Amino acid sequence: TSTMGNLQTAINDKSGTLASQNFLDADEQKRNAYNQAVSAAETILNTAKTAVEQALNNVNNAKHALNGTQNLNNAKQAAITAINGASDLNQKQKDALKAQANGAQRVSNAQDVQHNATELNT
Amino acid sequence: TMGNLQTAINDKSGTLASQNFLDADEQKRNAYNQAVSAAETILAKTAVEQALNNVNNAKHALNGTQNLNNAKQAAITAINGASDLNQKQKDALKAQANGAQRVSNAQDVQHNATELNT
Ligand SMILES: [Cl-]
Ligand SMILES: [Cl-]
Ligand SMILES: [Cl-]
Ligand SMILES: [Cl-]
Ligand code: NA
Ligand code: NA
Ligand SMILES: [Zn+2]
Ligand SMILES: [Zn+2]
Ligand SMILES: [Zn+2]
Ligand SMILES: [Zn+2]
Ligand SMILES: [Zn+2]
Ligand SMILES: [Zn+2]
Ligand SMILES: [Zn+2]
Ligand SMILES: [Zn+2]
Ligand SMILES: [Zn+2]
Ligand SMILES: [Zn+2]
Ligand SMILES: [Zn+2]
Ligand SMILES: [Zn+2]
Ligand SMILES: [Zn+2]
Ligand SMILES: [Zn+2]
Ligand SMILES: [Zn+2]
Ligand SMILES: [Zn+2]
Ligand SMILES: [Zn+2]
Ligand SMILES: [Zn+2]
C-alpha cells in the first residue's frame, strides 16, 4: 500500500538515524523506544492497514521524541553556568573552558568540560 | 545562545548526507546551505538568535522524505494504470517502488513500468 511505502521510507532511515548525535545522546528510554518501533515495523515489512498505520505512527513518534540535540544544549549550558560560578578561575581560563563547552559535539564532551572546570576551580 | 548556534552548525555534515536533504527541492537545499554559512560567519544576541532560527527553520523545511513518498506514490499510480501489465509484473514493479531509497529510484521504476506497458 501507500501506507507500506511510507513505512518503508521510515525503516530505511534507521541506519542514518542511529548514527546521528540526536539519537546517540537521546535518553536511553527514548533510544529504546525508537529501536523497538523500527524492529516492529521491520517485522511487518516481512498487514491490515491499521497495523501498518500504527507501526508507522510508532516509528514517527519515537523518532520525533529523540532528544540528543536538546540534551547537548542542556549540557553545554550546565557547563557554562559552572564555569561562570567558578570564582577562583581567571578570565583566560573561563574563556578557554567556555570555548570547549560551546564547541562540544557530544553530551560527554560538555560534561567533561564541566568536571574539568570544577576540578581546576578547587 | 552561541552554544546553541554551534550545535546547529556542527550538524551540517550529517544533515548534508541525509536523504531528507539530498532529495529536498533545490531551493530548500540552498536555503539550508545559506543559513549554515551565515551562522558559520557569526561563529549582537538578536543576530545570533536570528541566525539560529534561520538554520532551524531551513532544516525543518527540507523535504526529501516527503519527495520520496510522493515519488513512490506516483510510481504506484502509474503501475496501477498500466493496463497491459499482468499481476506478476505489477507486483514486482510495486515492490521496487515501495523499496526505493532515493527519489531517482522511484522515478526509474515509474519510467520502467510505462516503458514496459507500451
Ligand atoms: Cl543529529
Ligand atoms: Cl533522512
Ligand atoms: Cl530511504
Ligand atoms: Cl518517466
Ligand atoms: Na526530537
Ligand atoms: Na522537513
Ligand atoms: Zn541531526
Ligand atoms: Zn519530527
Ligand atoms: Zn576559593
Ligand atoms: Zn568523559
Ligand atoms: Zn565532576
Ligand atoms: Zn577529576
Ligand atoms: Zn580531585
Ligand atoms: Zn546530525
Ligand atoms: Zn536519513
Ligand atoms: Zn532522515
Ligand atoms: Zn516541491
Ligand atoms: Zn531573542
Ligand atoms: Zn524541526
Ligand atoms: Zn509491499
Ligand atoms: Zn533515472
Ligand atoms: Zn520517463
Ligand atoms: Zn526507456
Ligand atoms: Zn520506448
Side-chain angles (χ1 to χ4, degrees), chain B residues 31-32 35-36 38 47-49 51-52 54-60:
Chain B
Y32 178 66
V36 175
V48 180
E49 279 160 7
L52 175 52
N54 283 349
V55 178
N56 289 337
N57 287 341
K59 188 182 183 169
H60 187 81

Side-chain angles (χ1 to χ4, degrees), chain A residues 34-46 48-109:
Chain A
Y34 175 74
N35 288 318
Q36 291 168 204
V38 178
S39 303
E42 285 170 347
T43 288
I44 290 160
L45 301 170
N46 317 142
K49 184 191 169 194
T50 47
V52 182
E53 166 175 301
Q54 269 150 199
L56 175 52
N57 190 47
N58 288 346
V59 179
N60 290 339
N61 287 341
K63 189 184 183 169
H64 189 82
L66 299 173
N67 65 339
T69 304
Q70 99 165 140
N71 282 347
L72 177 54
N73 290 325
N74 288 348
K76 290 185 180 191
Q77 180 57 79
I80 294 297
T81 296
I83 289 155
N84 285 334
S87 60
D88 290 0
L89 303 183
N90 65 34
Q91 181 63 23
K92 199 196 177 163
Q93 295 162 324
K94 286 176 192 265
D95 286 347
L97 285 161
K98 283 189 188 179
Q100 295 175 35
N102 281 333
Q105 311 91 333
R106 294 301 295 277
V107 164
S108 64
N109 310 130

Side-chain angles (χ1 to χ4, degrees), chain A residues 2-28 30-46 48-66:
Chain A
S2 90
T3 312
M4 288 283 202
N6 278 47
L7 187 55
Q8 288 250 241
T9 297
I11 92 100
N12 282 346
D13 195 38
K14 176 193 163 146
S15 68
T17 301
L18 289 183
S20 75
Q21 180 283 321
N22 185 59
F23 174 83
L24 293 168
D25 282 342
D27 300 337
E28 182 173 3
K30 293 173 167 70
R31 297 191 309 263
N32 294 346
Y34 175 74
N35 288 318
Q36 291 168 204
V38 178
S39 303
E42 285 170 347
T43 288
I44 290 160
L45 301 170
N46 317 142
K49 184 191 169 194
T50 47
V52 182
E53 166 175 301
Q54 269 150 199
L56 175 52
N57 190 47
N58 288 346
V59 179
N60 290 339
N61 287 341
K63 189 184 183 169
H64 189 82
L66 299 173

Side-chain angles (χ1 to χ4, degrees), chain B residues 5-26:
Chain B
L5 187 56
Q6 289 183 239
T7 295
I9 293 167
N10 286 350
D11 201 39
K12 154 195 143 151
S13 71
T15 299
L16 291 185
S18 71
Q19 183 281 325
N20 186 53
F21 176 82
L22 294 168
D23 283 338
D25 301 339
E26 179 175 17

